């Protein structure tokens, strides 16, 4: 939940300052690359799978994107396409279709 992620971010900031102190580097200019190097030094793991190795990352990178509750206190959902069960996908499709209608009315670099 949001409060949980906020607490995790506070924990991460405090721990980042602690790790900077441990390694003697400046807490202010301590980057994620520095954190990864420090953790790799302090907790050496030879596990082949990089994901199985110790990680001290931002909670944003760690935790998966959790979809927020889709209705308010009154119970009414927020998006008018909520009951489709795929509100975001169908909203995107609806917007694309509207753009196509407007276009029809008026008139090796990427993948």
């Amino acid at each position: 939940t949001e409060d949980f992620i906020k607490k995790q971010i506070e924990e991460f900031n405090i721990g980042k300052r602690h790790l900077a102190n441990m390694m003697g580097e400046d807490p202010e200019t301590f980057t994620q690359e520095d954190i990864d190097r420090a953790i790799a030094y302090l907790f050496p793991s030879g596990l082949f799978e990089k994901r199985a190795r110790p990680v001290m990352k931002h909670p944003e990178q760690i935790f998966p994107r959790q979809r927020a509750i889709q209705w308010g206190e009154d119970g009414r959902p927020f998006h008018y396409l909520f009951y489709t069960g795929k509100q975001s996908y169908y909203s995107l499709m609806h917007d694309v279709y509207g753009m196509l209608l407007n276009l029809e009315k008026h008139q090796i670099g990427s993948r």
Partner: protein, 86 residues
């Protein structure tokens, strides 16, 4: 036997394409039912088997004609999806 010869089931070859002449003659015999009649008359088809085959062929023709009618009726609706996306 008692009729004149070379009038019935006779086709004239055009420019010497006997293959085309034979194809035309075969189409004529098939459409008139002579080929199927000869194939069926090779052995005696007992009356009950004949009746069953005739009924089966009639049902098959009814079904095929109705399915063809449905296909031709719906063929127009093979157009490009007009409301693509929505």
């Amino acid at each position: 036997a008692k009729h004149l010869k070379f009038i019935a089931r006779t086709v004239m070859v055009q420019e010497g394409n006997v293959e085309s002449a034979y194809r035309t003659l075969n189409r004529i015999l098939t459409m008139d039912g002579l080929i199927e009649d000869i194939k069926h008359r090779r052995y005696y088809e007992k009356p009950c088997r004949r009746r069953q085959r005739e009924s089966y062929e009639r049902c098959r023709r009814i079904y095929n004609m109705e399915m063809a009618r449905k296909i031709n009726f719906l063929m127009r609706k093979n157009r490009a999806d007009p409301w693509q996306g929505c």
